[model samples]
Target chain A: APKVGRLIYTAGGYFRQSLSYLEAYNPSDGTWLDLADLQVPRSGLAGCVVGGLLYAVGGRNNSPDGNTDSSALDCYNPMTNQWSPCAPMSVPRNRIGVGVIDGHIYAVGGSHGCIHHNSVERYEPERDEWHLVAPMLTRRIGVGVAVLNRLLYAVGGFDGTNRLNSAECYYPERNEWRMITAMNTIRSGAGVCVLHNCIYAAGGYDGQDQLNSVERYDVETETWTFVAPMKHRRSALGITVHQGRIYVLGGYDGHTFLDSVECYDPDTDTWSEVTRMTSGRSGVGVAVTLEH
Target chain B: PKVGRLIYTAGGYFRQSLSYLEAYNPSDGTWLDLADLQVPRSGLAGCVVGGLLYAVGGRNNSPDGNTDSSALDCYNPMTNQWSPCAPMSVPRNRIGVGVIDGHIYAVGGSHGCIHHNSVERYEPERDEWHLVAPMLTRRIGVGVAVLNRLLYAVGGFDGTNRLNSAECYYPERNEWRMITAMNTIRSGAGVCVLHNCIYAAGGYDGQDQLNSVERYDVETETWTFVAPMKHRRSALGITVHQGRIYVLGGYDGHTFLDSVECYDPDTDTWSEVTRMTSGRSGVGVAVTLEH
Candidate 1:
């Protein structure tokens, strides 16, 4: 199976709407499709695709000046354009680092409202259950993940006080998480993608301010190499891969929201602007999948 | 606050081993010999869950590491008696015991020369032992504690090697998960919990017997180094009383021990406490509040 698939632009707070709006982008035609809105309007939810179904886990629901943390585990079938409920997580948090390992959906560190979390749980579809897994070494909110080399890399995020520059990777075989190399700059709400075996990390707040700094990690050498920055400072951005290019979408710039879309071409090692989304959204989740 | 009653039961070498049970009251500083165990054994483990005292797996011969025992028994301090429950599917000695959500969790013990990572849970209500999860590594003399509702299995020795790796088990999910490694490689340590935090006091840290201690915070999942124990220990009995951790008698590599000590988590210090009536290694200790 190829790593690339259809792309999904998920629920997020924006310039308009209930914040449950979910949109899909087709790379073949450069088009946008409005699918179904979320049952509960929410933002900062951890999103991932496992067993050919899209799952949206913990996040914060939409209420004016809301601090209502959510634990909704909803699965979406693009083929049916329908949503179904899965078991809710024992730990309710959002802005998480989520991924798939051998058909299991692992949900990693995040926060409810304030303090970052260190708990981790995996969703097992066979039992229709969510079982607690080993914890990440550090608490995180607004984290990112790079799935490659059969290891899932949890990128930087806020750990209550400081913006973290460290990273950790989880191997299914070990059933444990071990620290890897740290990134060049501290980041939260960043986008992560694995291209040609190199992990590309870009666009997030860098503690001092919203950041456009980008870096690449040599998954082979276990080292980080500085890369070209994005066009705008961004946080809470949607990042994914399409046709071997790294795509960065809607996020905040520390001051205002952004609908900006761009991709990093590994061949050119450059950033190229792309068609933008309809509504300006920050704090959204993005994924790429092929049509069934 | 009352530190609760301390009960020491059943552990010794074969020729001298006894099934003797005794209780210590901190207020009066007196010891009361209680009812004996169903079987005479040494190197056994015990714990209290939902106010009932439990003693599980140990060995019969103490002169040399000999046959393992799978006998499981429960004691009612109120009744001053012993009752049999479901026995462990696997016979283990030098095992670690922990409790969460009214269930007793036993992890990592040895059957004679053989070490095990197999974990077992006992539900008192059902009078049954269920095989739930296994530790990541085979261990003997591992430390077990329930902190913040998660069961942690700490340092131990395999049949061949000493280990520093630690792992946690979650009861709600029936899963055993991994955690950060201990600072030192050791086995045969004492494990207890105070104020929702886990403490690993005396053990073998690979080289010699260890008094070096550390506490694990379940919230951050980090192990913080703390004050060392007064003496290095192995195959020892450890339990929580009131808010303090009591470390009991065990073999200290050079001598069999009856000396006991207590650790004050509040002051982050250790103090010599009441000594056991007799020197015994491979013992089991449990604590329960007086009704």
Candidate 2:
């Protein structure tokens, strides 16, 4: 007697301070509904949807006394709108990059305090476990990871002291990571998403300032090229692909936290500002889910 | 014992929340390093009462990112030492602090995404914090001060938007009454009562960083514009020493600042003062009376 439903979920993030809030955005009405909170408050975390269940991966907490890293892998059920703990990663990661392929979630590079990681891990839902995968060629934090054509793409991020322009791809069948064409400009904390068979990387920090620049990766051409940029400079933003558009959500603009949202139309090669969230957030993890 | 006054600025964030504490000696115009806090903090509030300095709740850095802190610490100038005191009932960051009749008041602030309208009062004799009357609206990064015997809560973020509204707490009556609002909506402004008037300076107004200053006169019950500061800042440290107002390190839209400037009420002018050793914002400032 009910139709299937699809909603965008935004998980824990920092808003002048870190939060445990988990909220759902309904595009149908352009509003949000509060969901159950995360078991632990976190920021710089990663989120993924696998087998219709939402998995919240590793992130660090805002603690001044040190050792604020978290290795939690929490799972959420849409039917009950509740969250439960799942198997955690081997190591704690913050600002982590994540992607899902073949029902398996891949957790990529991030930092543990000042230690940027090159390590990578893969999760098996059937086994409810995470295992080591071939590490990336470069160590990075705040990297962007997305899945396209069954290949996992790990894009621009900070390799500890410097921001990177280099991009890499991983093949589950080969269990190895290979370098891809570098982007036109260095970027860290950019929002990366897949659309129309191409991968798009948008607004991020490029060492000196937050960026409003955009770039696209053509799989057939094996090259990166320029695209229309967003209206605002952002870093630590959230990215998701839904209904043929790439949506970029809340992030920091250096001065203060942001609540603005922008979506890019691949067909038109343009971006349009949309309704904003109720609160400003950065380092947030976003994922779109469909329920029947 | 030396009959001198010194300004203390403590714990702020540039790269991370800091535990560093430094004292500025106006006599030599230099900052001297002092003891560190028990834990690092940013977005904290400070007040001096009966020669003892108190640092209230703030946000701290962790592996999780920035978490709210409920810690309270007391410093004795005579001993040059900091000791722990009772914390508030709830964690708060960017709280507005004020002192009245030897009692310290903690006003609205936020704990993560939750903004607060709750108020608390601390009694030194009991070394404990007690709940007081709450404000009409929730606020975070509120600017607070004391004019006459009443505690004032100024502009701050009120969950939905930056606030231009202001209110004052009447201790005798235990009530908070709305007052005339400021011309501009601001959050994280530095508020200090000087020359028997309340001076609110330099904060963010949703869109821009402000350098404007406003003075509130109790008798006339009006807020009037005054000479603005040289630089725009938010989350800056402000304190009154001798006859001048000192505004210290804060974020200026681009980066954290180490710059210090002093304002003269007599001339209605601001002049650049000495810089701190490190650039920081979200710092807390207070002055010790000449003993």
Candidate 3:
């Protein structure tokens, strides 16, 4: 129980949480705690723990339809339990693919004003600034990004033409992106997380339908295999890993906004019910932190 | 062409004709200035046949009902364009149009309520309007629906007091037959057919706005009361989809109402849904949902 870890949702939920409210989920006792609201409320935003500080990044403050995306970036200190402003991104973006590796956060492809973006930006905690990196091979929105084996993978997203089944990886050390094998099923705005060295892609929009299907990516083999499907169809979802299981959080289910959550286990290759969030949200910020 | 778009073109302002067509795509919440109608007019009757929208007779510019033009204009959604079509023999304003078996039926409406009972049918293939037997009652604001190949004309004002009279037409037999009248003597109510049952809901029932709803079955030939709506609404727009009747904005005697409601035949229940951006009366409504 001492090292079970905390799942902090920094910002970005639909309806109410769009106004920047933060909530933390504790896996130890299976409880949640509310924290300081975000400085600027937004949806379709991303956040992560960089050098022990939770930094919330670019997202739209209004328009449930993803019309606008912001460039504002802000951070919070778990020690002081306070939020502060940070430098904004060079470009306004939302529905972005985000990954953190080697103490730096990489913000990848997303959309702005309902337009697809190919631009990528990297954030350095020490420099307190953002710099442009190599853009993705394809312009995409609704992308899912996660770091596994210390390399960043940009999963499925919606190009201007269609929802993508394709994927690519970024070698941050080399400052380049390489096209990877496409997923078996197309996914957009899905929740992707790395657990037990395997990347799990779950609950997203697959162009024709909102998906409840999940597949796992084995980086070493460059192979993706089907996993136990999730309980709900999630797009614009939040996902994070703590301990051995991966947690999938709130997202739009195509019919309406959703608040349900689910946890997936790699050992058993099974999905179990977690619990509903305080509010149903789409495009929520999900992060894993050591401090409670 | 985006989902949830409210496409509107043409309207009469200060008795002036305007061909300005605009489509509001609620999906992305954007409004685009579409192509203008060839004919500038108002009060035109529109009905979709074979997925094509036919705009029929309405007032051009004259105050006299004679100013009504029978010039039929058709809009092809597939090509995103509008073109001219065969004109009606007798053009009238405030006309009601309905679709049956891929054909358009133009029924009661009048030049200033000639309270025309004249009925006609337009075949998209022939591009012609064929005269059918006139309605039994001369009325305006008549609501139309098609069920079992029968074109049903419901409650309307007969240039006088509101009339609850209901009638049906058979194209094959070229006949007009009277059916049981609505219990409420109302006009301007919206009518729609869902699951083979014809519904007449909300109207100006002579003295007041009626939230009452009734369903008529062809087999039973009976008008049965199901459920009333949440608010009194008349001249509202009605559309049927997903096994429910969506009743949109209209006048509630006191003000133009923007409130929307839905009635589920499965439960025979009416529940309030979301309201539109603004209230409207005598608004046009259509459905393109695939069955």
Candidate 4:
């Protein structure tokens, strides 16, 4: 498989309301540039790249109580620098997570009011219909999910009462869930990625406190080991790996929000500071582009 | 005690910031326009009345961080025009609140990185200052202190912490102590006086959420509840009544906010007022004078 190179991250809220735009970070040059602004302003949305087009799904416009429940779906083609509306999701979710599997996008759990949901829905671009999938074993919001060897793993998240450490794997072949080893620490609003045979969980809140601790889970052994922690503790941050290095960006630190970016090198198990963004924000979405 | 009509409020932010000023009614109508832009800026610090005019102080250039502290002090006359006055005790203390008694005036506080313990008193006729007893607390963010026989400060903020309780000062005795607590919590905000017995605490944070209710007390010894507000907010919002409390612009959760809510004591509730000309805000201080 080809390695990932450029990553595009976008979301809303800092200085401007309802902003949609993409930022590309080039690992070779260690530079970032604004690609284009999105068609609409939104916060708490989900984005994923399927086939070559970037798909952005439901998000809220204002505060939770004043949120606009939009089923708006749009796809951006980098080659054309254009966005076109796609078939919308059945349910409108603001703070949701999305993952692509076998050329299909899976839209998972989020909140509508104060309620955490367990619903799972899949989108087929060709048919433009969102099909219902197996509901998650636990209801959560602000979750991180990824696919490895045809199996989808749903990791740590907040289940209304508290942050959950339990992990579940979904085998699309069987359309069911099998429990996996729980995380060393329970946290929500963190980021997770599958690199090689191990899954890495990094930076989130454990109910009252924000955490910087990083840990990895070995699928073969069903075990976890604590790795080097991040320089700063943050929640609702965005994390993605570009050329074997993990980059963490924009999150709140309780008192104020941050724009600082840090990269973690697995080979040395050390982290180095990177360039900061212009705006400090929380609750954002990030994705890496596959090398063509 | 003479209840004055027509207080002046001016200078805040929106897309371009503002220096536009308005006069508030203490009896029936809302704020009436008294002047136009004098500086075209936001974060205009505190406002105080000296002689026949009201002097509004320094504000910041940007919304996120401090850029330039304002040096221009503009005063509003009864004829609805603005003119320059003597500069402040220091440079760029954007949220410094002021109060006047006889010929002695006291201005305290600053914003963000420029906090101070320096309190300066100004003599209007002489156009000069004399230092007085400094506050026991050296806070320089945002605060409100009133002369209710004695100077009683309800709540304000340090650069980091939001205060829930308050302290009072006896000018004659020259002493300070903690007083009866406020029912609702807040900081970096504003408050107002309605009757001799009632001091209303309006906006401030409980940390996670901004509050909109007012905690009014009949006596410094006793506290009583009143009508809650229609909005949840923080930062520099003020209420001046012609006959009701006309709330003006302030920040909410987002950047450089603009929303206005008014309170009527007789009706025992709040109502939305005409939105401000601009959305920008900092420390809001109000003074009413008879034309």
Candidate 5:
């Protein structure tokens, strides 16, 4: 079964041109490898894995006085060590989030022309086309999307006006959205992952500065609880679950970007520094790939 | 009569978007407002002047994602009112310098995609265009071109490299050749002018942060040192006037980009002028327009 259990993270931002990837092992150490270079240099894009293929979607190039939208899409197969193109998105966007549910990949809200957007679309790999889906309730950028059980969860984002403390859950079966418990504080550019029955949101900007606060939304109780805080406040970090622990990697803290990787053992409520990546970056995308 | 007697400083980057323009009067101990801004922007691509018109070029939008390459050309007639015109260059290149000779206006270098090899000259009376001598060097983006009889394109940029050297363009002869060296190695971006036979290069990156002062001699073919600025800066905020250089607003280090002062050649020192309308910018241009 190709169910995702191993976390693979990709590079972004100032470090996106470099060839580096970080992976976390369940119990302890995390490993990094140099992967095939991106066909075109880019940053502020989204990535997801569906049907054993890793698909990278639209992102903007950050060159000074450069354009803000792109239509490039590439799919990578870990086993074959190869990459190929996919059908491009209808509208180009950067700093978006992608999640897979029932074989359909959902592309979420992003920024276009410095304005936050609420557009959402779904990609059908079998038909090789993208269809517009239900739009998000709020326009935002640098959001995190995760699927728990059968519902898609959209978490903290900047809404062009302010960082949001809201979270929404999309029930595909019902085609309805339900508001989840609000986060402890307003945040944007955070990372979110699901473990057990709890959804963990960690490390993002609180409008004034980056935050190290961690909070968990319990599915059964429909309540939020404070968790152990990380050592540093960062935004645009990659968060994932490998084995049984949650790993956070590579984020920016306003003044300086960092390359530190840390793991949280939910059982003990402690965060331990694991391994660092080759370069510091923010707004990166991460996923889990099966080992051959 | 139109020698290097006055300087006019225009808009540039600070944080993200800023709108501020000021003029320096060396004879008087003060600065003046030529006009209130029609467009509030920063990181503008280029600024050029022709006849009595001063033109400001492309810049980015706010919040960090939009690149507004729109042709927003505002002409200053040395009054409070600014006339809007169509933009000359497309795809907005930040950090370009402009030169006006007779009926021809040539703008060199750009920032974003690639450095431009194309040079367009405009005739105001006929509202026409003619392609003149292209520069031997393909500089992507540059700072200021001081027309010392011959057009001298000074300190700007090369690939990712900043150049302290200069090149000379002879419009009559229709050719360009390299000239004397600069006192320091810089590239982050700065402005230059020829005053009293000496080409003064001030406020550029020493590769790490903004620098205060450096001067070059066109006559002796040598470089002479000057007093270091009260503050190190790149991306100026103040314009020049009356044979004296005004050090307006600029950034110090990468963190503090703020309001500063002006320099007077007669006193050989600097004095705090009016605070800048904005703060912290790079890639700005200035020109003096007589009303």
Candidate 6:
């Protein structure tokens, strides 16, 4: 048997416009390895892992003349080192939240140009089809979703009107979404990941400026608390948990696109700068592959 | 009511190069349309001398739209007209013009594809342009201002890259000496003298449009960072009025702007001001005062 290790994969992001970039971070040596690109340029997209494969969801192509949202679904196989088209979504969604639970990928709240959506859809990999599910309580774009304790938690995002501090969780058994206690800060485009039974939300825009502060959500108590902040203010960043440590990659820092990466140690409650990515990016998607 | 000092902005580009000249009254925040330029142009420079406004060299079209202009037009407020004057020795666009010791000095700009280090001066009385001392480095989109009777030429593009370097020319000595460079590279920046110091505002820095500002003290010969504007602007029109710096209408890399922002040195802050009737960039601004 081959030894197993985890690799965090980053999908396409916005650099002046939508990008087709794809790369993976090797946690063992602290370096990035280039991977097959997305089928097309995508920014404000979401990434998720299921059955040891990477899935890139909806985003938009922001050209100088006009903007067009994408509904195309793409799947990447580690063995083949290539990306293939899958069943597209019901409607185009940019900056949507996605999570995997019960061997299924659930796509949540997103937007299409000026129109924001609270609609939720689930993908059945077995049937190669997508079906609508219980919609969220609020329309959100740039939302962050993470699965914890068998429930899919959709956190802070922009609701077309404001950057939200409100949160909610979905129950597949009842096909219902119940509201959860809001976070301490209002954030849109926040990077979220579950670590040690705590859901950590880091770095997003609050409306006026990009934020550097971070907060934690307790699953049992259903309450949010403050945590150590990152060194730089970031929004639309890619974050994932690898070997008990949380890693956050490329994002926008109010000033410029960033290639910087940072890691957080739960025990120390501190963040430290790590090896940087090859290029500056924002509105990226990240997910860790199952041990292989 | 007596009309106060008027700020005139001439020849900007929005869709096509514009020949529009508009005057802004800071007292009531109103604009009065003035006589159009003889030919539509952008990237021009303007200076006020002896109660007359001189609109100097600029391009006739977009960057890819080639055709530089050496045509000089002089405006007389008394007669409400623009009359042609002797053109520059060469067709120059994005030129920097400054008035010093009763003479108008035209510094570095580009002619077709050639960036110029050549300097020319216009004698208002004689209505003649003559070549003077050339700068050490060729510059385009440079900032020209007068301080202590000397002509200062600031950062601009040197063909390959945006510049941070600055220099000043002694009119009597006919020599240009390099001064301290700016903290950041800028081309198409808005530079003007305020409170006896040279203030350089928002411009493009190759990768991004900037909102950062820096000020240089001629006494100490040091450039220091200052509070920036609310929006990133390049090729904006900047002029001092009643002890305040008014920056108006420029491109933000995405779209042309019609917004205006005023900076108060006493408060070290910038506040939104009334906007122009239309968006403009590569505008030439000058203020007239009674002698």
Quote the positional error of residue A200 for candidate 5 in Å.
0.7
C-alpha lDDT values of all predictions: 0.76, 0.86, 0.74, 0.64, 0.63, 0.86
Model 6 Cα lDDT, one tens digit per residue, A1-292 = 5345678899999875578889998888776789888867889999999998899999986432123578888999998999999999998899988998888999898886567999999998889899999999988899999889899999999888788989999998999999999998899999988989988899998888888898989988878889889998999999998878899998987767889899999999999998898988899989998644
Tens digits of per-residue lDDT, candidate 2, A9-118, equal 88999864567889888766787888999977789998888878888988876522112567789999988999998898988898999999888989999987567899
After superposition, which runs of candidate 5 have C-alpha atoms over 4 Å from their true positions? A1-7, A15-30, A290-292, B1-291
Best by lDDT: 6
Return the top candidate by DockQ. Answer: 5
Model 1 off-target regions past 4 Å? A1-5, A13-18, A290-292, B1-291
Give TM-scores of the second chain, every candidate: 0.91, 0.96, 0.81, 0.78, 0.77, 0.96
**Alpha-carbon deviation at A194 in model 1, angstroms:** 1.2
Model 4 iRMSD vs. native: 12.8
Runs of candidate 2 with Cα error greater than 4 angstroms are A1-292, B62-64
Task: Quickly count the clashes in candidate 3.
Answer: 2
lDDT of 1 by residue, A102-161 (tens): 778888888864557888888898888998878889888888888786888899998888
* Interface alpha-carbon RMSD, every candidate: 29.0, 12.4, 21.5, 12.8, 9.2, 16.3
Error of 3 at B182 (Å): 55
**Per-residue error (Å), model 5, residue B211:** 30
For candidate 4, the docking band is: incorrect
Tell me how many clashing residue pairs each candidate has.
12, 14, 2, 14, 7, 0
- Give DockQ: model 5: 0.05
Candidate 4 local distance difference test against the native: 0.64
- Candidate 5 chain B: worst-modelled 10 consecutive residues by lDDT: B198-207
Tell me the tens digit of each residue's lDDT in model 5 across A57-78.
7766553322345566778777
Weakest ten-residue segment in model 6 chain B by summed lDDT: B59-68
Please list the Cα RMSD from the true structure of every candidate, rounded to 1 decimal place: 22.6, 17.0, 19.8, 14.7, 13.1, 20.4
TM-score of each candidate structure, all chains considered together: 0.49, 0.56, 0.52, 0.55, 0.56, 0.53
